[PDB]
A and B are shown apart, each in its own frame.
With several copies, the nearest count.
Chain A
Amino acid sequence: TYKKPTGGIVTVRSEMGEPIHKIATRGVMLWKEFDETIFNLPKNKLVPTLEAKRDYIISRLNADFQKPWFATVNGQARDLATMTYEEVAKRLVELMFIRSTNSWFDVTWRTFTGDFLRRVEERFTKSK
C-alpha cells in the first residue's frame, strides 16, 4: 500500500507526514501523485514548480479532487485576480450553498459570503 493500489487501498502522507490508509479514489490517486512530485520538495523548489505545472494542477483539481480550483467560471480555468466580484459571489454560492437541501452546508460559509458582499458594497459606494 506504500507503493501502489493493493485491494483498492493505498497509504497517503498527511499535512504532518503521518501515513493514512485511504481508499485509492481518483482524488486520493491525485493526492498520492502530489505527495511524490510536489510536497516532498524543499522550500526553495516549491514555488517555481507550481508556476511551471500551473495549468496541469488546476485541470486535475477540477476533474479529480474534492476541493476544486476556485477561479473557474463555466469550466474555463482563470485566476482569482482575473475574476469579477460578480463571478466570485456566483462561484461561492455554487460550492458553499446546497441546491438539494436548499441550505448553506455550514453557517460559517454563509457569514464568509455575507462579509464578501459587505466588502463589495464598501468598495463601490461613494457616500455613507
Chain B
Amino acid sequence: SAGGIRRPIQIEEFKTAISGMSDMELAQIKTEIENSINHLQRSNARLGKYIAKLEGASGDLALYKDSVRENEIVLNNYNERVDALEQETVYRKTGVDMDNSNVDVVTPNSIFI
C-alpha cells in the first residue's frame, strides 16, 4: 500500500486518502506502519548501545546523535499517521375543567352544534 512506505509522508493528504478506503485496507496499512515503527525502535535500540558505549569514554559521536535525532522525525510521522488511523476508525462507529375555559358550554353553541 502507498500509506506507510518506510519514508515520511504529509498528513493532510493521508487524512483525506484514508476516508475513501475499505476497512480491510485500513487494517493492512495499520499492520504495515506498526511493523515500520518496530523497525525504527529496534534500529534506535542499536543506535542507543553505540551511544552508551562511546558516552562511557568527540569525532564519530555527533554522527550517531543526528542519526537517532533523524529517526525520531520519521517516527514522529509514524505515530501521527497511526493517530489518523484511530480517528478514521472512531468515525466509522457513528456513520375535569368545570371552568368553561376549553369548551364554553354555558353558551348553546360550544357543545358541537
* A interface residues with partner B (beta carbon < 8 Å): 15-17, 42
Interchain CB contact under 8 A, B10 and A15:
yes
Query: In this assembly, does B77 line the interface, its C-beta being within 8 Å of a C-beta of chain A?
Result: yes
Mind listing 11 A-B residue pairs with CB under 8 Å?
Answer: A15-B10, A16-B7, A16-B8, A16-B9, A16-B10, A16-B77, A17-B8, A17-B70, A17-B73, A17-B74, A42-B72
Q: Which residues does chain B contribute within 8 Å of A42, judged by CB atoms?
A: 72
Q: Which residues does chain B contribute within 8 Å of A15, judged by CB atoms?
A: 10
Q: Which residue of B lies closest to A15 (CB)?
A: B10
Q: Which residues does chain B contribute within 8 Å of A17, judged by CB atoms?
A: 8, 70, 73-74
Q: Which residues does chain A contribute within 8 Å of B8, judged by CB atoms?
A: 16-17
Closest CB of chain A to B33's CB: distance in Å? 15
Q: Which residues does chain B contribute within 8 Å of A16, judged by CB atoms?
A: 7-10, 77
Q: Which of B66-112 contact A (CB under 8 A)?
A: 70, 72-74, 77
Closest CB of chain B to A14's CB: distance in Å? 9
**Which 9 residue pairs of A and B lie closest in terms of their CB atoms, listed nearest first?**
A16-B8, A17-B73, A15-B10, A16-B10, A17-B8, A16-B77, A16-B9, A17-B70, A17-B74
Q: Which residue of A lies closest to B77 (CB)?
A: A16
Q: Which residues does chain A contribute within 8 Å of B70, judged by CB atoms?
A: 17
Q: Which residues does chain A contribute within 8 Å of B7, judged by CB atoms?
A: 16
Q: Which of B32-73 contact A (CB under 8 A)?
A: 70, 72-73
Q: Which residues does chain A contribute within 8 Å of B72, judged by CB atoms?
A: 42
Q: Which residue of B lies closest to A39 (CB)?
A: B73
Closest CB of chain B to A20's CB: distance in Å? 13
Please give 8 more A-B residue pairs, beta carbons under 8 A apart, in addition to A16-B8, A16-B9, A17-B70: A15-B10, A16-B7, A16-B10, A16-B77, A17-B8, A17-B73, A17-B74, A42-B72
Closest CB of chain A to B80's CB: distance in Å? 11
